[PDB]
Amino acid sequence: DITVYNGQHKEAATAVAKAFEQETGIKVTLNSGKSEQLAGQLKEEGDKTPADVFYTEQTATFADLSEAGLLAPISEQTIQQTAQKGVPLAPKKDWIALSGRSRVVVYDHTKLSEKDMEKSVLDYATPKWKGKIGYVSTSGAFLEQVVALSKMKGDKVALNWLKGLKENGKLYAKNSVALQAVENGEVPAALINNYYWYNLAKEKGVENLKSRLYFVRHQDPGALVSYSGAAVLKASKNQAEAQKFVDFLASKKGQEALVAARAEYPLRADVVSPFNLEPYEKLEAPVVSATTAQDKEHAIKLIEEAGLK
Amino acid sequence: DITVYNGQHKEAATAVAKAFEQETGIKVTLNSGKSEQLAGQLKEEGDKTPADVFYTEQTATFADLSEAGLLAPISEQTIQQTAQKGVPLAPKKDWIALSGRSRVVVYDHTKLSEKDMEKSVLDYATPKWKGKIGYVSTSGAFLEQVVALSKMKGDKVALNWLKGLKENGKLYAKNSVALQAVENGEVPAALINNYYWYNLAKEKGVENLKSRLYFVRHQDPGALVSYSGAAVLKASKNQAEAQKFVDFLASKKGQEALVAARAEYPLRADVVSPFNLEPYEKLEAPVVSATTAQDKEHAIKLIEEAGLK
Ligand SMILES: [Fe+3]
Ligand SMILES: [Fe+3]
């Protein structure tokens, strides 16, 4: 049996866990929490951690752990299975990307049309959007967005964008809350990840939603796709089973289990999401290098500088 | 007017040069030679080089130059244009990949069928292939193959493969010569890059060729796609024009010019090669990280160790 530190949304974890149990008879115990505290805790437990696997919303969360040598290597053959355009590869083969989440703009289509949308994510952080654009600065994908800005456009552009959000945007604690804020009409638009919308649409029927998704495309930084993944703890006592679980998540059955439950992009070529996602290729997402521990600290620095935290 | 140090096959360079001149009225002077000597020479000339642009068969050739800060940065927007699955991105935005070349096995179809081919590139380096498999150890893509082996399979596997080639394979000075050796029946099969074959087929008619291509697929290291690219010299006096030339090579018209002449894969999504190449996606090529200067030295070391050089 194995213990999974779960930084993914609960519905994602349960779905793959149940499937795995069903397929193999290995029981999975989930210890759920926010991707960051979890990463922190693993550093602190070191070789005494009870965790076997760490499953998180953002591969960027693996940077520190990998640098400190806390993660075990995966087979190259597994890694190759989810290697698609834009997907980061762990330099030490000690973590794997498994699903993609797109940055999107959600907006109230009963107040706006595509026609009112911007051609760049940069443009939302302006007075023109004063108190009209929601954002989530504590979001993991928000930080990746910052790193992407900095790498694609440079620090000044990035900083300006942050300062702009601070002055003009409405801050929400979580992506889900931001999405609700649009539906409830608190704000007309918000920057979040794609999956929340589709998920909400399935529960409620798109016909009943005020909100719709807008894709920035044309390789803008705001077209960023970031990835969720997993890693095996070097400290694990149950290597056979831990490895088996990570491999399963990269298999056709594990990808199917995940995509059925959550509107994230599968990374295997032979799996179709049932959610009718906007086709990857049409996203025109830019390719960005993997976020390193140093990239991470740097983005944090900018956020602070802009006075966001 | 600009001066291009040309490490690409002459027919590639001329074709893009002519096109560029035609489109812009800027004259291009080509100084042709082998990608390595050229790279060496640029190091040696430093800030006194007369080169404006360096155009080469293998992006790996840029590693040293970039490390020494000899290359100028390109626009991120240009870089994004050729960023496809598997394509390496320059960490300092100071070089760009422009076309892909696949590793392939060519074989005499009047002596063998696919059925006699191997499922892995590893298997050709065996006694079963004694004096029956041609290889080119001085080839730029050969070195990349070595790096890929080492990164995917580890050093021992790599070394074994090299030693195997040494004992069992027939060595040729160049890819073209290897290809001819198959046609002339000196060897039944050889490891080269895809473009030579297609090019030969167009001049001569496939119906007149003994040789055919075999793709290893399934993410084997022998399914490697490596890339040709260009860079602007930091020392250039003609930056405006040099940059314009690199941007042109990444444009639709520059990619078209190239693919018309040479059977390499375009990297832009809106360009179709007229050569009827095996579709990229069907190659099942593995994704490998960019070759660093250090990777390069390491591969050289293995080659030596195996007694190849
Ligand atoms: Fe989330
Ligand atoms: Fe060549």
Curated annotation (Swiss-Prot), chains A, B:
<comment type="similarity">
    <text>Belongs to the bacterial solute-binding protein 1 family.</text>
</comment>
<keyword id="KW-0406">Ion transport</keyword>
<dbReference type="GO" id="GO:0055085">
    <property type="term" value="P:transmembrane transport"/>
</dbReference>
<keyword id="KW-0732">Signal</keyword>
<feature type="binding site">
    <location>
        <position position="196"/>
    </location>
    <ligand>
        <name>Fe cation</name>
    </ligand>
</feature>
<dbReference type="GO" id="GO:0046872">
    <property type="term" value="F:metal ion binding"/>
</dbReference>
<dbReference type="Pfam" id="PF01547">
    <property type="entry name" value="SBP_bac_1"/>
</dbReference>
<keyword id="KW-0479">Metal-binding</keyword>
<feature type="binding site">
    <location>
        <position position="9"/>
    </location>
    <ligand>
        <name>Fe cation</name>
    </ligand>
</feature>
<feature type="binding site">
    <location>
        <position position="57"/>
    </location>
    <ligand>
        <name>Fe cation</name>
    </ligand>
</feature>
<keyword id="KW-0410">Iron transport</keyword>
<keyword id="KW-0408">Iron</keyword>
<protein>
    <recommendedName>
        <fullName>Iron-utilization periplasmic protein</fullName>
    </recommendedName>
</protein>
<keyword id="KW-0574">Periplasm</keyword>
<dbReference type="GO" id="GO:0042597">
    <property type="term" value="C:periplasmic space"/>
</dbReference>
<dbReference type="InterPro" id="IPR006061">
    <property type="entry name" value="SBP_1_CS"/>
</dbReference>
<dbReference type="GO" id="GO:0006826">
    <property type="term" value="P:iron ion transport"/>
</dbReference>
<feature type="binding site">
    <location>
        <position position="195"/>
    </location>
    <ligand>
        <name>Fe cation</name>
    </ligand>
</feature>
<keyword id="KW-0813">Transport</keyword>
<dbReference type="InterPro" id="IPR006059">
    <property type="entry name" value="SBP"/>
</dbReference>
<comment type="subunit">
    <text>The complex is composed of two ATP-binding proteins (FbpC), two transmembrane proteins (FbpB) and a solute-binding protein (FbpA).</text>
</comment>
<dbReference type="InterPro" id="IPR026045">
    <property type="entry name" value="Ferric-bd"/>
</dbReference>
<comment type="function">
    <text>Part of the ABC transporter complex FbpABC (TC 3.A.1.10.1) involved in Fe(3+) ions import. This protein specifically binds Fe(3+) and is involved in its transmembrane transport.</text>
</comment>
